[PDB]
């Protein structure tokens, strides 16, 4: 579903620095790719870094990435495969998560992505994400999780 982005949400410089775990998406991408870890370094208002993931074809693999920021949107570019390259709009940003939405070749009718500071976010974080999604006209129940990552015994 297309979101209703906030009126004047700010994406602060360096908000995306460091390590994130891309654990929940709509539609669910996790039969195509899993165990997604992102690491971003600041370059001014932009970022560069690395995405690692488990590929059904290639196993654990790594890619260099660039994020080019303009206001509340950014351009995502990956070095060696381009199916996720798109403009993405920031929907929500928090100390513990961020959410963006774009239309890459992999999901051209729209792809919402939730990035977490924790590999297995605790319930308090998940509840805040639920609320943030409702505030942008989305609904957590229509997202899928990466069930390959062991978050429960
Ligand atoms: C899920 O993703 C995580 C994060 O990428 C994977 O953990 C990483 O696994 C690799 C391979 O075992 C580790 O690489 C090793 O790193 C050391 C030090 O740089 C190097 O000496 C070795 O030769 C090798 O490169 C890496 O450290 C490790 N990272 C963490 C934080 O544990 C994990 O394997 C993935 N799992 C699956 C099932 O996809
Ligand atoms: C895309 O980025 C990845 C990750 O940096 C590159 O992977 C490296 O490739 C070199 C050889 O070209 C190896 O010596 C490194 O060990 C690889 N690094 C990692 C972390 O896997 C990959 O080469 C890049 N691909 C292209 C086409 O630029
Ligand atoms: C902001 C977007 C975040 C995207 C992170 C998702 C991880 C993507 C990682 C690798 C994609 C590789 C897919 C290669 C498809 C090859 C096509 C084919 O031959 O079938
Ligand atoms: C994703 O995981 C959260 C946390 O365990 C859970 O509450 C939610 O129901 C999960 N989503 C699906 C579709 O299972």
Residue numbers in the entry: 1 to 153
The authors write:
Complementary DNA analyses revealed 22 distinct but similar peptides encoded by milk genes with homology to the lipocalin family of lipid-binding proteins, which are referred to as lipocalin-like milk proteins or Lili-Mip in this article.
Surprisingly, these protein crystals diffracted to 1.2 Å resolution and we report the first structure of a naturally occurring and chemically unaltered, heterogeneous protein crystal grown in vivo at atomic resolution. Residues Val51, Val65, Thr81, Ser86, Phe100 and Leu113 line the binding pocket and show multiple conformations, suggesting that both oleic acid-bound and linoleic acid-bound proteins co-exist in the crystal. We can conclude from these observations that the monomer obtained in each asymmetric unit is a space average from all of the sequences, i.e. the crystal is made from packing of proteins with multiple sequences.
